[PDB]
Design a protein around this motif. Structure first.
Motif, short mmCIF file in Angstrom:
data_model
loop_
_atom_site.label_atom_id
_atom_site.label_comp_id
_atom_site.label_asym_id
_atom_site.label_seq_id
_atom_site.Cartn_x
_atom_site.Cartn_y
_atom_site.Cartn_z
N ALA A 153 1.23 4.15 -2.87
CA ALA A 153 1.12 5.59 -2.58
C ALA A 153 2.24 6.47 -3.22
O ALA A 153 1.94 7.54 -3.81
CB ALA A 153 1.03 5.81 -1.06
N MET A 175 3.48 9.78 5.90
CA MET A 175 3.64 10.29 4.56
C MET A 175 3.06 11.67 4.40
O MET A 175 2.14 12.05 5.11
CB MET A 175 2.93 9.33 3.58
CG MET A 175 3.49 7.93 3.62
SD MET A 175 2.73 6.80 2.44
CE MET A 175 1.11 6.70 3.06
N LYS A 176 3.63 12.44 3.48
CA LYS A 176 3.05 13.70 3.04
C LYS A 176 2.53 13.47 1.61
O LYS A 176 3.27 13.70 0.67
CB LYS A 176 4.09 14.84 3.07
CG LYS A 176 4.49 15.32 4.51
CD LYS A 176 5.45 16.53 4.48
CE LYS A 176 5.88 16.99 5.92
NZ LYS A 176 6.34 15.85 6.79
N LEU A 177 1.31 12.96 1.49
CA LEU A 177 0.75 12.57 0.20
C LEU A 177 0.13 13.75 -0.49
O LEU A 177 -0.74 14.38 0.07
CB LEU A 177 -0.33 11.50 0.38
CG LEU A 177 0.04 10.15 0.96
CD1 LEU A 177 -1.21 9.26 1.01
CD2 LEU A 177 1.16 9.52 0.15
N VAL A 178 0.58 14.04 -1.69
CA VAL A 178 -0.13 14.94 -2.61
C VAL A 178 -0.71 14.18 -3.78
O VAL A 178 -0.46 12.99 -3.94
CB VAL A 178 0.80 16.05 -3.12
CG1 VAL A 178 1.24 16.94 -1.93
CG2 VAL A 178 2.00 15.47 -3.85
N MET A 229 5.33 17.75 -2.69
CA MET A 229 6.23 17.20 -3.70
C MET A 229 6.22 18.01 -5.00
O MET A 229 7.26 18.18 -5.65
CB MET A 229 5.90 15.71 -4.02
CG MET A 229 6.74 15.17 -5.16
SD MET A 229 6.53 13.37 -5.32
CE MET A 229 7.82 13.07 -6.48
N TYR A 242 -4.92 5.45 -1.50
CA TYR A 242 -4.37 5.04 -0.22
C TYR A 242 -5.47 4.84 0.83
O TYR A 242 -5.54 3.76 1.45
CB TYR A 242 -3.34 6.04 0.26
CG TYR A 242 -2.70 5.56 1.53
CD1 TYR A 242 -1.69 4.62 1.49
CD2 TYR A 242 -3.15 6.01 2.78
CE1 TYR A 242 -1.12 4.15 2.66
CE2 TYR A 242 -2.56 5.56 3.95
CZ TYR A 242 -1.57 4.62 3.88
OH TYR A 242 -0.95 4.15 5.02
N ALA A 246 -3.75 9.87 -5.55
CA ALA A 246 -2.86 9.13 -4.63
C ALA A 246 -3.41 9.06 -3.21
O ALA A 246 -3.40 8.00 -2.55
CB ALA A 246 -1.48 9.72 -4.64
N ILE A 249 0.79 -1.25 0.00
CA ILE A 249 0.00 0.00 0.00
C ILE A 249 0.82 1.29 0.00
O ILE A 249 0.51 2.25 -0.71
CB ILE A 249 -0.99 -0.05 1.24
CG1 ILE A 249 -2.00 1.07 1.20
CG2 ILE A 249 -0.26 -0.06 2.58
CD1 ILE A 249 -3.15 0.89 2.18
N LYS A 250 1.90 1.33 0.79
CA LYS A 250 2.73 2.51 0.84
C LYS A 250 3.56 2.71 -0.42
O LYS A 250 3.78 3.87 -0.82
CB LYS A 250 3.64 2.48 2.07
CG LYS A 250 2.84 2.73 3.38
CD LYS A 250 3.79 3.01 4.57
CE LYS A 250 3.07 3.69 5.72
NZ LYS A 250 3.72 3.36 7.01
N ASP A 267 -0.07 8.37 8.19
CA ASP A 267 0.86 7.25 8.40
C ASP A 267 2.29 7.54 7.99
O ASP A 267 2.93 6.73 7.29
CB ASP A 267 0.36 6.03 7.64
CG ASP A 267 -1.00 5.60 8.08
OD1 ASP A 267 -1.31 5.91 9.25
OD2 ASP A 267 -1.83 4.97 7.36
N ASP A 277 1.74 6.27 -6.97
CA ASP A 277 0.56 7.05 -7.40
C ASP A 277 0.84 8.57 -7.40
O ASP A 277 0.44 9.30 -8.33
CB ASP A 277 -0.65 6.77 -6.51
CG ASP A 277 -1.39 5.51 -6.88
OD1 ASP A 277 -1.24 5.02 -8.02
OD2 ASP A 277 -2.14 4.92 -6.09
N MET A 278 1.57 9.02 -6.37
CA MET A 278 1.98 10.40 -6.28
C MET A 278 2.82 10.77 -7.48
O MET A 278 2.58 11.81 -8.10
CB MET A 278 2.83 10.68 -5.02
CG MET A 278 2.06 10.99 -3.82
SD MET A 278 2.97 11.82 -2.50
CE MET A 278 4.63 11.18 -2.68
#
Lengths: 213, 221
Positions: free
Chosen positions: A89, B62-65, B50, B73, B69, A85-86, B60, A92-93
């Motif tokens: 992530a 992460m710094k998700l953009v 990013m 998640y 995405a 999953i990570k 969790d 996907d980013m």
């Protein structure tokens, strides 16, 4: 199982990234080109296009439309979507950034002529100041040959595909990004990708002045 | 069990679908609102973004953009992305159609004024002839309460969100689609969604002309 069958125009458009990904995976596929309004109408009428649009890919009993759905399924099926999953992530980013840049370049031709020189200039500034720095930084952070998990993924493929499009536009843009250049070279020498870039593959050319729809 | 932190403007924009999803999943989150161009510059200079843009969600470690995405998640984590990759393929196909229509609706307020009447008419035609028929067809196919796998998924949540925005645009568009009306009602009565739809939740209002110029100020466009 059934060989995947790609339905689209005889052109790059929104099907090219799927051709790249399947080819990179070593997957044998067939294409059926839409050459007329009538061909498109027949797919629509017969119920095979959920939202009345191509691309459509026949794979594993589905008639899959929407580029992103097709690509997500292919990447998972052929182990190009990381291992957890990570990792998905990060992948996907990365690939959503690649798609945002890609979409700008995709649409540049059908811009109005009086906006078109300014849109080009803004694309080049985003390439130099936003996107290429971001991917160079990822590659610098771990020093490995692949973007994620030290293993080939869709992110390496989608990125290297875009690096070829950016080269067509302006060969100078990558010049200050040595790790991006190196990725382009390594990926391009993988046997499957090497074969795809060679003549006689499903890879498609850029659209030329004779683009009448 | 740290709360997700959502970095965005105080508005729906490209963060609202994440608010819906998290709320549907019963997950509590906090929001840190960007209120000035200086706040955004700070996120950028602190290396939080990013690609120098929001939405951004801290989750969790992460710094998700990138909205997709973030959503992908959250959906996988909370078991709202189907049971296997074939169910995920159906979910993706449906939600990408929803995204395409949602995008047209999101951008309507920045449509060139001279193009707005034609564009509004084209969106309504696509709703009535393309999108609403496609989802009505899927629902009629299996007769099940949910879009995919006989089980709640992100596809139900994103579709119902869209049905609320379409009602805001024109309440008559759904009238010929009984099964979509029925899905709206069922999903809206699930406890977590019912709590989210009630006054007081983090759900955001429609963008008015005020909120739009405030976005112009911060985003610098």
């Amino acid at each position: 199982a059934e060989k995947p069958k790609l339905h689209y125009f005889n052109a790059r458009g929104r099907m090219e990234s799927t051709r790249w990904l399947l080819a990179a995976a070593g997957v044998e596929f067939e294409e059926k080109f839409i050459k007329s309004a009538e061909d498109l109408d027949k797919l629509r009428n017969d119920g095979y296009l959920m939202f009345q649009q191509v691309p459509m890919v026949e794979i594993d009993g589905m008639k899959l439309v929407q580029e992103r759905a097709i690509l997500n399924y292919i990447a998972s099926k052929y182990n190009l979507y990381g291992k957890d999953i990570k990792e998905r992530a990060l992948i996907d980013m990365y690939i959503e950034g690649i798609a945002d840049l890609g979409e700008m370049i995709l649409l540049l031709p059908v811009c109005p002529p009086e906006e078109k020189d300014a849109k080009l200039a803004l694309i080049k500034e985003k390439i130099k100041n936003r996107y290429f720095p971001a991917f160079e930084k990822v590659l610098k952070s771990h020093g490995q040959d692949y973007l994620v998990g030290n293993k080939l993924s869709r992110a390496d493929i989608h990125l290297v595909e875009l690096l070829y499009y950016v080269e067509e536009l302006d060969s100078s843009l990558i010049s200050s990004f040595p790790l991006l250049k190196a990725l382009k070279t390594r990926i391009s020498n993988l046997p499957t990708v090497k074969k795809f870039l060679q003549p006689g593959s499903p890879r498609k050319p850029p659209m030329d002045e004779k683009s009448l729809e």
